[PDB]
């Protein structure tokens, strides 16, 4: 029964007395539910150190992972080029899931096609499917370029994408000059960042391998920028803005910002902006190549150093204060352009915020997780702010990354209690935050559930979540934020300090109980 004037959605409609009685009758009559005391006992046992010791003994079971498969990153990398339709050689459910994931994150249309391989393709293969898919994709959704990736199914059957595409071109199914790069992206190896790396390396190979004879390093006076797997449009915009302010000539070799932020003016645009094929062809002529996220760009770095002969600098992700300064200085050294006064003023403004907010960020324990480069930059920034990470997690991190993070932590007096984990899911993190309670979590929307469990134990044990990463599903338009450079550091500092202050305000709102510390000025 809903009143017409005040219509209730599922909440709080299902809190009505009749609905509560119906649910109670359903629970008692037929659910055969365990007694509530047993449930509480099991929960309390799960919140203990013994349960953590059992949890970290896991070898085969993974609960609530914090990563995705390679083809997702491959699709994102493909979306970064001009009129390049991401085409995945494999089953269609994958592509559907990729599209749903990206639509839920960016809240924008995402274009991705599949050849819809089926049980017939398991035995025979995926040659005819590849030919038909290429022809239909070029006829119906006209692109200037088609990027070909693979799902696990195509990898297990051991397809031969190069041979299939060559046969398709040969047997009158597509023009022999139509750009069709490809990459092998097994979903059971690495994660989505590895898929992005493989896709970018395949595209660069396809566009530059056979024309290195006439390429002179530095003949165009430009610096190539490879952003890697990035999910914030603000980072793409801020990198270009800073490079333009320095006056350096640049070529962003992956720019999906335009297609992922198209305006709603009454018409639908399937393609928008992106890196042109001419830029990819002229890339070997650049002065150098700078990798924004050097950890999940190993294959790209190998290809660039081996083939393009560019000497890629060893630069960390430009997150925080020190690494942004290092990136700016390295770019100035490579291009010769002096650092303008606007960037100096912006750095000073960031230092002003750091000095103003330092009394609230000091001695705050944070538990983070996410991509390797993003997590490393966030840890560096937290160490710079005086915050002490306690639980640094990265599901798809390797041992060298852990060594680097440990080296970073050991260089500061605030990495004393920090523990790095590589290969642990969010159940391990739940146990860690239950037994060694931090002040806040910093991560994607999945930690949203952890904050619920920590609330069930008690209000005093709750660990608030700060949504900085990929994917974010329960907050609108957070993908427009910035995390790279000085602007991205200012936004992150503001988010952290305001979250701390909001939690403090919530804790001190009880009237005549804890409201004595409900200060107007903080």
């Amino acid at each position: 029964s809903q009143q017409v004037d005040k219509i209730k959605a599922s909440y709080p409609l299902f809190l009505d007395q009749d609905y509560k009685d119906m649910l109670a009758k359903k629970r008692d009559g037929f659910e055969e539910k365990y007694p509530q005391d047993k449930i509480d006992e099991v929960f309390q046992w799960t919140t203990t150190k013994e349960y953590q010791e059992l949890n970290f003994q896991r070898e085969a079971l993974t609960v609530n992972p914090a990563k995705a498969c390679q083809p997702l990153g491959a699709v994102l990398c493909a979306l970064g080029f001009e009129k390049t339709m991401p085409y995945v050689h494999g089953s269609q459910g994958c592509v559907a899931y990729f599209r749903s994931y990206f639509n839920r994150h960016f809240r924008e249309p995402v274009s991705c096609v599949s050849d819809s391989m089926t049980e017939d393709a398991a035995v025979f293969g995926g040659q005819q499917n590849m030919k038909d898919g290429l022809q239909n994709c070029k006829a119906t959704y006209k692109p200037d370029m088609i990027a070909v990736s693979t799902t696990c199914m195509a990898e297990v059957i051991g397809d031969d994408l190069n041979a299939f595409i060559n046969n398709s071109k040969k047997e009158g199914f597509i023009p022999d000059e139509f750009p069709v790069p490809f990459a092998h992206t097994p979903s059971f190896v690495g994660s989505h960042v590895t898929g992005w790396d493989n896709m970018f390396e395949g595209i660069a190979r396809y566009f530059t391998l056979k024309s290195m004879d006439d390429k002179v390093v530095g003949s165009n006076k430009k610096i190539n920028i490879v952003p890697g797997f990035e999910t914030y449009l603000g980072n793409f915009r801020v990198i270009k803005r800073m490079l333009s302010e320095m006056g350096v000539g640049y070529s962003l070799l992956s720019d999906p910002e335009e297609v992922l932020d198209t305006p709603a003016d009454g018409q639908f645009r399937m393609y928008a902006g992106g890196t042109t094929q001419e830029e990819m062809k002229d890339a070997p002529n650049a002065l150098n190549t700078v990798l924004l996220q050097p950890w999940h760009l190993e294959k790209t770095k190998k290809f660039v150093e081996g083939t393009w002969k560019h000497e890629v600098p060893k630069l960390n992700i430009p997150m925080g204060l020190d690494w942004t300064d290092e990136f700016l200085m390295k770019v100035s050294e490579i291009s010769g352009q002096p650092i303008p006064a606007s960037l100096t003023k912006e750095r000073g403004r960031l230092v002003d915020m750091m000095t103003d907010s330092h009394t609230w960020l000091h001695g705050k324990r944070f538990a983070l997780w996410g991509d390797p480069d993003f997590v490393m930059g966030l840890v560096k920034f937290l160490l710079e702010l005086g915050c002490e990470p306690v639980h640094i997690l990265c599901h798809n991190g390797n041992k060298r990354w852990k060594k680097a993070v440990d080296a970073i932590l050991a260089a500061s007096p605030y990495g004393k209690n920090a523990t790095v984990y590589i290969g642990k899911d969010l159940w391990h993190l739940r146990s860690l935050v239950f037994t060694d309670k931090p002040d806040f979590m910093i991560g994607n929307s999945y930690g949203k559930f952890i904050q619920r469990d920590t609330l069930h134990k008690g209000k005093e044990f709750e660990v608030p979540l700060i949504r900085i990463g990929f994917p974010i599903f329960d907050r609108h338009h957070l993908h427009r934020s910035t995390t790279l450079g000085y602007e991205g550091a200012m936004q992150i500092l503001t988010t952290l300090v305001n979250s701390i202050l909001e939690r403090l305000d919530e804790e001190t709102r009880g009237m005549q109980a804890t409201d004595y510390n409900h200060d107007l000025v903080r």
Partner: protein
């Protein structure tokens, strides 16, 4: 630096001033000599401020409403006049309290008459009466009303004493008119004097003929502790573990009943001499109650003050004081052992209102920090008499320092830490010099007692050794 370098710095700073301002400002600056007992031979104080030099002082309204009358929670404090004075001072001071705001407590609420142009021309004595009627109508649980005058009130000639008497006779409610106009004094100190006079003349003597209160030989009252960040609380517990019964607090977390019960005690413990000596002397003269000054900043001063207060009483109180000191000894010893190595040898420059520039010196000494300069905004010569025995030799002293003088002194001396108000915090935070708000404890605290010393040390360590002070210089410059 020696006495010769400091005087040269003082002359170089004063060289930019016009000759009259230069002559006036030369009197307020001096180099400390601990052998000097009469500060009037060195420093002049409680003088007017030189116009246009950007002083840091306030008004008598800030001294009375903001400082003294404000922390009283069970009363309603009307700001008679325009909106600005009351609006700017609302909840800006961290005088903590316990109560249901808007029902029985009104510290963080702004009650004002909100003068318009029709009230400047035709007066506001009827508006005040109507406002009192509305206050009684809407807030029935208030235990009194205090009408703090703003600047226009005195100038337009408004009789608020008559209104207060008439409405108090009518409603049988305590209404206190305070003539704390902003122009009446050179700083907040006269606001303290006016507020203490109002307390003496309208509130204190209500229960002179009442003997129903059960007095004990251990009754004391905390005077001049305004409970910044809970400070008074951290002191009160330390005075009740020794067996003493704190009957009243003035005025942080204070109520109009404790003020009236204050004349029924055996000793007045005055923390802020500057703001409450006026009422302490009146109580000693009239009721015979002795009073003494205590310092609860740092472990050393806290121990000395507890021993003195115990010595004011019998042997059981002294035994309890020794028990309390023994109990709290390891706690502050651990804090010192942890934080002193990090804060050893650091140099501090302070500039606070009238009490803390000399009280917190003991706390910095216990952490191995040397105060190379201190000064006040609205302190009198007494305060400097007490200060000269606290500061080391050849340390700079200033009174009512300007922005230019303070900035030049800081640039030459280059202290490791600076303690002052909000109006100087960012000036020195843009100079790469750590800054601590010594007024509101930088939204931290409490700092009184043994429990506050750990917080004090932690804050000083977190600000001086913060990694944000090494990044101001751009690496490419």
């Amino acid at each position: 630096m020696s006495r010769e370098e400091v005087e040269s710095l003082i002359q170089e700073v004063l060289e930019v001033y016009p000759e009259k301002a230069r002559k006036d400002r030369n009197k307020h600056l001096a180099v400390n000599d601990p052998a000097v007992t009469q500060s009037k031979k060195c420093i002049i104080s409680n003088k007017k401020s030189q116009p246009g030099l950007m002083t840091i002082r306030g008004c008598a309204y800030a001294g009375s409403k903001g400082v003294v009358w404000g922390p009283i929670k069970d009363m309603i404090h009307i700001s008679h006049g325009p909106v600005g004075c009351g609006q700017y001072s609302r909840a800006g001071r961290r005088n903590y309290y316990i109560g249901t705001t808007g029902v029985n407590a009104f510290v963080t609420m702004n009650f004002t008459s909100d003068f318009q142009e029709k009230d400047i021309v035709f007066g506001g004595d009827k508006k005040l009466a109507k406002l009192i009627d509305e206050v009684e109508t809407l807030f029935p649980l208030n235990k009194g009303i205090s009408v703090q005058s703003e600047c226009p009130i005195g100038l337009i000639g408004d009789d608020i004493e008559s209104v207060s008497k008439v409405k108090g006779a009518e409603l049988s409610k305590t209404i206190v008119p305070v003539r704390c106009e902003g122009f009446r004094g050179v700083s907040q100190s006269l606001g303290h004097h006016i507020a203490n006079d109002a307390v003496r003349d309208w509130v204190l003597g209500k229960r002179d003929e009442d003997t129903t209160f059960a007095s004990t030989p251990y009754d004391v009252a905390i005077i001049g502790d305004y409970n910044i960040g809970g400070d008074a609380w951290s002191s009160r517990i330390l005075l009740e573990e020794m067996g003493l019964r704190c009957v009243a607090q003035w005025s942080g977390d204070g109520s109009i009943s404790e003020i009236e019960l204050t004349p029924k005690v055996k000793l007045n413990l005055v923390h802020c001499y500057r703001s409450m000596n006026y009422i302490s002397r009146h109580m000693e003269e009239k009721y015979g109650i002795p009073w003494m000054e205590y310092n609860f900043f740092g472990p050393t001063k806290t121990i000395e003050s507890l021993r003195a207060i115990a010595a004011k009483f019998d042997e059981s109180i002294q035994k309890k004081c020794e028990e309390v000191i023994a109990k709290y000894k390891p706690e502050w010893e651990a804090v010192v052992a942890k934080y002193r190595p990090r804060l050893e040898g650091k140099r501090v420059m302070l500039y606070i209102g009238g009490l803390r520039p000399r009280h917190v010196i003991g706390a910095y000494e216990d952490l191995g920090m040397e105060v190379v300069g201190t000064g006040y905004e609205f302190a009198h010569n007494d305060d400097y008499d007490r200060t000269m025995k606290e500061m080391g030799d050849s340390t700079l002293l200033y009174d009512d320092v300007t922005g230019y003088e303070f900035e030049e002194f800081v640039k030459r001396i280059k202290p490791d830490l600076i303690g002052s108000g909000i109006k100087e915090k960012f000036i020195f935070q843009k100079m790469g010099i750590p800054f601590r708000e010594m007024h509101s404890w930088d939204y931290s605290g409490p700092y009184h007692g043994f429990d506050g010393f750990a917080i004090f040390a932690r804050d000083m360590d977190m600000t001086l050794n913060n990694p944000c002070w090494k990044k101001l210089q751009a690496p490419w410059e």
